[PDB]
Design a binder for this molecule. Structure first.
Ligand code: D3M
Ligand code: D3M
Ligand code: FES
Ligand code: FES
Ligand code: FES
Ligand code: FE
Ligand code: FE
Lengths: 341, 341, 327
């Protein structure tokens, strides 16, 4: 019920779309997502103007989505291009809502609010995902929790030390150094674990290479819920700019008030042509983000009723600065909109 | 929550009942339906007056339904005929509600509203179901949608062109001619598809007959949600009367506000003694009515919250006349009751 | 939504707890139940004060439960004993609620209400469960019905077909039934292979504040004190989970065939000792009909066998009102 509608959200990964429509709900709005014959992606309200049937269950005819119930056909703009009934007239009332959609950086961005306020120049920058110098692998995940819980999770990558201990635990955690940068529509949480033994996973990034290492876990947040992290590890004490790293795509899109879509990926500049390294990253993604994080956040969502019924508020720790700031920016965006209508 | 209680509804097909009670919910009312030893069907509120146990889980004793919890026995009138506890007294408070029920035309009709207003002369006529000149086959189906969505579906038989695309397909759909006839508690939609290629179904009807054909697809609606259609097809261009036909039973009974029972059947006057034609009708029903229709309407029900939250109203086409009229008669009946009671 | 919070409820059987926390909901309150290294059971609100993660999914560190999300560690009192972040300060806001818990009679009792009113002297007496003269076997069961339906069932003395007698005390109610000789079938199956000749049967049940019951099933030759008879005291305790679901703790404490594995298996069966499948179908079915009975104005029609149940039911209702009246 409480969403920030005026903003770009990822609705799907390119590989998920085709001429066969995908039905997906974004911010409590059912959408029919498909790629037209010319390759351009279209996003229509998944509700036929005639009798509300799911257009996503239909097929393309002459490149146009055909409602499976009574045959009305629509173009990517939501305009009804064919009515096989009676005089076959096509009054404006037969047009269906179409959403602004942009395919960029191997992501399908959608604007669920006022289409007049849709500005592609405001789409977060995830260029590394299509940078030939980087190798990108990732996937999709559905989680039964409010998207904000996952934003919190990610804005404190420090949870890895426990929730993903088997892979990310470090014996230098106590020596953690952290800063928070607030910018124009952007917040960054910087983390540096100095001179520690590489973690199981960082050891894999360096290929079983132990030796005293330096690690960085930064994360950038952009308006609403799009984040890109910086996971780097380098021996002794080398520069952070000359180190091996992975820029992780971590984007959340609310489905319902208590559920969300999770788009994740890894864009690395090492072992670029190595199927095994691809396996490590995918294995990590499947185990950490899709299961371990899922377990915790889904359990937290189940306890929301109790915390709200009672007057329980969270007790912040020294690692929550970035998360609280992001959280407050989102709350402000919610309030602005609530004040628009 | 919103039902027209003062009307006869089909609660079950005769073959569904026996001495073993059937538990079924009609208009949010749980019923225990069974056939007594003398063969007369009884309908009791499926809630024991003692501690609310489901009488439908009990068995008959001396022809009386015995509650499975503590043994109170009831007769078809809902009267408690035996109390095995203490002095075994049977105060009126132990009687359970019994509903007016009539077995006619191979259908079990029940009156869930004001019992004093129940009048068997008001039961729709489905005589063809027990006419020795007709061969009748059918069945039952449960659907997760408000019953009105299925009334719309049936009153707008045209959808078969796209929904049943593989069976009811017709190359004369654009040469369609409709005719609506209004009446008291009765509305009829007539449709004709002359001089065209028969669909696979009609083909199987005329035993794979060659040459063009003249079909007939009418449907009659009676107060609330009981319909009988007329599917006729004839060699080339012959009369509508002498034509081989099937009178289809299509009756809906709401279960909950978002779910309903669907009683269907075919009463044909051709291939009467042919197990195969039987298979042709049973297959169609299983395929078209239970599978294909189910999908479309259940998806529409899931989109109700969104259309209501927003102010979306349906955009009617030239094929919606009969459906809109029926829909308006039902709405009026709802209003009368809402007023009346 | 409607619970009597100020009372002791069984949250688990001893054998269910260990250093690996058990997550369980009691009266709509999620709990993390575990046994510390010294063997003492602890019960914490299963909600970390930091960001609400389930402590029940964590593990013990130095004998302290560690939240699986960001590592805060707590002691059995709910006090935060370690914060691995920043200056590692531990302000009182990091403490988590801890519930009064007592392990007695091979049962884990918890007080979910006003912690100030909790008094261990008020815990029902189930001593037979740890009496060396008795052999006790039992188990756990979950049921999708309001706990009151099971209280009714039990107060209707194993109805699966001096004399009558119902005693009403304070926070306690007993229903006694002594049946000389027999008419349908007596002597009982287990009691069979012991004590013959004319006998006397016994089937009583004791109810204690809210939903804890202990029954008495016994038999002895002609005239004989129910004390020295061949008997079994059945533990039948219910603890609401949600308004429409509950936990069922059951057990048998017998003084016969004490060293005989044969009987344990049957005396440990959920269907044979707590509720036959056929009856479980009934209480869950009754729960599904609550909406209809409430929507309409349907009230139950009592029979001659409902006396004990109605009385217990009325004592519970009074307890509900007392608490409600507070707030
Ligand atoms: C969750 O953030 C990560 C951490 Cl903490 C370590 C390694 C990786 Cl690949 C990621 C990632 O971006 O998925
Ligand atoms: C759905 O109504 C029908 C149509 Cl449109 C064509 C053929 C048949 Cl058999 C039926 C039927 O009664 O099921
Ligand atoms: S509901 Fe889409 S054409 Fe009828
Ligand atoms: S609930 Fe039917 S006899 Fe007791
Ligand atoms: S939620 Fe428990 S330490 Fe953060
Ligand atoms: Fe994580
Ligand atoms: Fe259909």
């Amino acid at each position: 019920a409480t969403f920030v509608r005026n903003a770009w959200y990822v609705a799907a990964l390119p590989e998920e779309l085709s001429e066969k429509p995908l039905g997906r709900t974004i911010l409590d709005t059912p959408l029919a997502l498909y790629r037209q014959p010319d390759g351009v992606v279209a996003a229509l309200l998944d509700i036929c103007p005639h009798r509300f049937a799911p257009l996503s269950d239909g097929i393309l005819v002459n490149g146009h989505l055909q409602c499976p119930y009574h045959g009305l056909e629509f173009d990517g703009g939501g305009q009804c291009v064919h009515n096989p009934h009676g005089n076959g007239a096509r009054p404006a009332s037969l047009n269906v809502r179409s959403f602004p959609v942009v395919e960029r950086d191997a992501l399908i961005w959608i604007w669920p609010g006022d289409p007049a306020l849709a500005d592609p120049g405001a789409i977060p920058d995830f260029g590394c995902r299509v940078d030939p110098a980087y190798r990108t692998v990732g996937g999709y995940g559905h989680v039964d929790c409010n998207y904000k819980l996952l934003v919190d999770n990610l804005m404190d990558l420090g949870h890895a030390q426990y929730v993903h201990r088997a892979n990310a635990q470090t014996d230098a955690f106590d020596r953690l150094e952290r800063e928070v940068i607030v910018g124009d529509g952007e917040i960054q949480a910087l983390m540096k674990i100095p001179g520690g033994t590489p973690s199981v996973l960082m050891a894999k990034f360096l290929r079983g290479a132990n030796t005293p290492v330096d690690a960085w876990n930064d994360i950038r947040w952009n308006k609403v819920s799009a984040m890109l992290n910086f996971i780097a590890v380098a021996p002794e004490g080398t520069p952070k700019e000359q180190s091996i790293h992975s820029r992780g795509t971590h984007i959340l899109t609310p489905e319902t008030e208590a559920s969300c879509h999770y788009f994740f990926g890894s864009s690395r500049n090492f072992g670029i042509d190595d199927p095994e390294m691809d396996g490590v990253l995918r294995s990590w993604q499947a185990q950490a983000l899709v299961k371990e994080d899922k377990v915790v956040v889904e359990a937290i969502e189940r306890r929301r009723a109790y915390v709200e019924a009672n007057g329980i508020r969270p007790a912040m720790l020294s690692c929550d600065e970035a998360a609280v700031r992001v959280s407050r920016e989102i709350e402000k965006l919610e309030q602005l909109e609530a004040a628009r209508l």
